A = this chain, B = another copy of it.
Amino acid sequence: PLAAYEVDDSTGYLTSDVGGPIQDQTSLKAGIRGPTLLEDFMFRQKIQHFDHERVPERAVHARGAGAHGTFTSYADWSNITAASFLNATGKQTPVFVRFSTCAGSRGSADTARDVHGFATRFYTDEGNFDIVGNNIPVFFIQDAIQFPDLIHSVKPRPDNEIPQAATAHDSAWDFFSQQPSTMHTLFWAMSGHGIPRSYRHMDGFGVHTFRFVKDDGSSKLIKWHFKSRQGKASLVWEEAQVLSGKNADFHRQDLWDAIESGNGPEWDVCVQIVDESQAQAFGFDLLDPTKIIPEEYAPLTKLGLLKLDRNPTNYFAETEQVMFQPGHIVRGIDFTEDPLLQGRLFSYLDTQLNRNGGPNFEQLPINMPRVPIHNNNRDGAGQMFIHRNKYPYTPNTLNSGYPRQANQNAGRGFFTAPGRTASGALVREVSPTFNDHWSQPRLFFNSLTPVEQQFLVNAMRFEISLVKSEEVKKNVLTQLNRVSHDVAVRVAAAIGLGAPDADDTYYHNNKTAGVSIVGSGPLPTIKTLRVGILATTSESSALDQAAQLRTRLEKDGLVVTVVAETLREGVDQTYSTADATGFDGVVVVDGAAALFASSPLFPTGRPLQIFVDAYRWGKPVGVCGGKSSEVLDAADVPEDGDGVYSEESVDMFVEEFEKGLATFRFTDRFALDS
């Protein structure tokens, strides 16, 4: 894919960057115990490179991971868009996708509670087209000019730089409560969408309304929705926290492993399509990025399949250096007057100068298009091209008038949708059509299941309880109360304040499909899900049981880890390094029961803690072999429990257990406010 740029070092002698064979292990010194010499160019070339390895992290979405893939169109979409990549059934275009958290620095944990990025580049035969989206369909703010306010508030306090990758501090909730537009995204982030099970188990959204533009000039309004084929799934908060410490790399490792095992994740790339006349028809403004179109109003149209199936060769060169822009647009697509989108168009082109340190960032391999470039851009630091045209100006006769101007009528040029207009005063004023900040947050809340609603309440209780300012806490209750009195009461109970009186201006009872995680039913596939088998080296029959279970589980593409006191043939991991956050279900072989009812080889009570944690976090758990009561009694897990299994037959154990893995979470183990 980027084969032309690969460098192989599987053989050969060390050389400088200019091909001179050298060594790099000992400095040149004036005598054997002498000082190092300035003339040692071997030393200086190697250390200079090392000294300059780092580049600025992205201003947001610093922490993330990418993979290569293919997009395949399901149809000829010419009848709605001139976009070349969508112009034929089965047409394939290479892609690169990067997923990320949003607030944390490089090296912060994947399983922070946060908005997540989902950025996709299509290397089309008419230019690179990027859709730079999030896993949440609405954004916090209604005007790009407010982005630094939002980001400053969410990022660590700037005196001490605390806390990392978290909204759980005063400044964030101060902003949220003073800028009520934030409520909708806030509710999404406080739901299980803020803590996805993996990048493969979340959807991607363009957020903004864009336009599809036909060759004839007619346009329609669209929203992009990348719908996961793996299904939707979340962690529970108290698992996400432990996982942040046990495996900061959880999401990037999950993605990397799925691709390597031939389970590359897939999404249906979809749009909602509506007429230009419907911009204000749905009870809100399609220019407002804090609003969704309910699927009951406009159904999803599937355009094609996105599949990620190839990991990068060098993370820095590919994932770190990929530079996405919403301004990377192609003929057939256009912008709308969404004031958040409008300002983004400026930001991405500008910020890449910061990251790259020079203007030629489009020439980096990962950023290059797959079709020829013909323009009069020249020079600049890091210029890799050697341009033959010595008359790089338009209009010219001395290069026969090339390159020629491309537009609607010639050379397949980009063109602005010709029906677009502007009218009015030049103003710094918010449209009153943007003013309802609360009805959609309530629509979202109403659409979650009872346990889902409790989890959202509990996320808010956790975070707001860490806000020191009594005034900020009260202000937060004021805003929450406008979305839902019941939310405000339940949150207030945790923080020892009174909720204010119900204000029903924005309350309503409407619901919408497709936003609940709990309500989206069992997972459509269990391939890649992780089963930890707790066993012991003290009983050769426990290992026999573990081996039989492994064979039967791996047959169905589950990723199996056998855990014992020490490593040996057939054991993957020791108890010392094992944790419940490492598994989607946990099985104990009854031969190992004694470990459950002290060792220098693992912390006290570790084998039982793995089982108890997994149970408490809602995972399918069980004992295989017939003798289950010693384990279940020690764990205080009821044998009759939903998602608790006990069979002597390995085949029968696995059949039941696999149903539990697809259910994924057993939500009856979590208490509800009365």
Contacts and interface: CB of A to CB of B under 8 A. Distances in A.
Interface string A340-366: 001101110111011111111011110
Given A20-B414, A25-B145, A351-B51, A13 B671 contact: no
Contacts of A475: 397
Contact of A54 (B52, B58, B397): B58
Nearest to A253: B162
Interface string A401-415: 011111100111110
17 contacts: A9-B387, A14-B404, A14-B405, A17-B362, A20-B328, A27-B143, A27-B343, A30-B426, A51-B351, A109-B248, A148-B393, A158-B316, A420-B425, A421-B423, A461-B574, A461-B601, A465-B567
Contact of A151 (B50, B57, B314): B50
Contact of A359 (B41, B52, B337): B52
A495 interface: yes
A354 B560 CA distance: 45
A440 interface: no
Given A23-B407, A148-B376, 11 more contacts: A6-B388, A17-B375, A18-B373, A21-B411, A27-B339, A54-B354, A146-B394, A244-B248, A353-B353, A416-B428, A600-B670
Interface stretch (A172-180, A503-511, A516-524): A172-180
Give this chain's copy count: 3
Counting chain A residues whose Cβ lies within 8 A of the other chain, the interface size class is 35 or more
Interface stretch (A31-39, A224-232, A585-593): A31-39
Contacts of A551: none
A542 to B, nearest CB: 15
A152 to B, nearest CB: 4
B49 A377 contact: yes
Nearest to A326: B41
Given A65-B161, A462-B577, A599 B395 contact: no
Contacts of A19: 369-373
A46 B145 contact: yes
Nearest to A313: B386
Nearest 8 pairs of A and B residues by beta carbon: A105-B107, A245-B245, A31-B424, A19-B369, A13-B411, A244-B245, A107-B108, A21-B406
Contact of A342 (B35, B403, B404, B410): B35
Contact of A378 (B47, B105, B152, B337): B152
A538 interface: no
Kindly name the residue among A9, A327, A392 whose own CB sees the greatest number of chain B CB atoms within 10 A.
A9
A398 B171 contact: yes
Contact of A403 (B14, B108, B391, B567): B14
Contacts of A144: 27, 36, 43, 47
